[PDB]
């Protein structure tokens, strides 16, 4: 009955704590929020370059959580590597949207992925109908009761299928 959930890990971790810090607990807390309500189909995407700490230009906290969530079959790392000198990063967003679109679930993020909706009609509509935004207050993960405005549906039904 519950929609599959797909979380933009980077969006969430940046929002949580200092906005200039990749706060891995942000991801834990969001995940737990869905767990507590009964969800079991949950996926969080984060680039794999977040795993390696030898010189992190955006700082990170509680890095170990990523691999923790990987083991529980919740977090999935996204691909990236260095070509010649520089880092190249297969885009997060694509995995996030493609998965949610094809699993017919929801996307948890405050990014609206303007690039992607400019690429494909079907993705634009999906994003409009299926983005779930949120605010954090310290460690409280707070999504809106009215995810699509007063005209759309309640949180509870947004997260169901029928
Ligand atoms: Na943050």
Author numbering: 134 to 295
Pull text from the paper:
X-ray crystallography was attempted for the fragment containing both the PIN and ZF domains, however, electron density was observed only for the PIN domain, consistent with a previous report on Regnase-1 derived from Homo sapiens. This suggests that the PIN and ZF domains exist independently without interacting with each other. We found that the PIN domain formed a head-to-tail oligomer that was commonly observed in all three crystal forms in spite of the different crystallization conditions. In contrast, our gel filtration data, mutational analyses, and NMR spectra all indicate that the PIN domain forms a head-to-tail dimer in solution in a manner similar to the crystal structure. The previously reported crystal structure of the Regnase-1 PIN domain derived from Homo sapiens is nearly identical to the one derived from Mus musculus in this study, with a backbone RMSD of 0.2 Å. The importance of residues W182 and R183 can readily be understood in terms of the monomeric PIN structure as they are located near to the RNase catalytic site; however, the importance of residue K184, which points away from the active site is more easily rationalized in terms of the oligomeric structure, in which the “secondary” chain’s residue K184 is positioned near the “primary” chain’s catalytic site. In contrast, R214 is important for oligomerization of the PIN domain and the “secondary” chain’s residue R214 is also positioned near the “primary” chain’s active site within the dimer interface. Within the crystal structure of the PIN dimer, the Regnase-1 specific basic regions in both the “primary” and “secondary” PINs are located around the catalytic site of the primary PIN. Based on these observations, we concluded that PIN-PIN dimer formation is critical for Regnase-1 RNase activity in vitro.
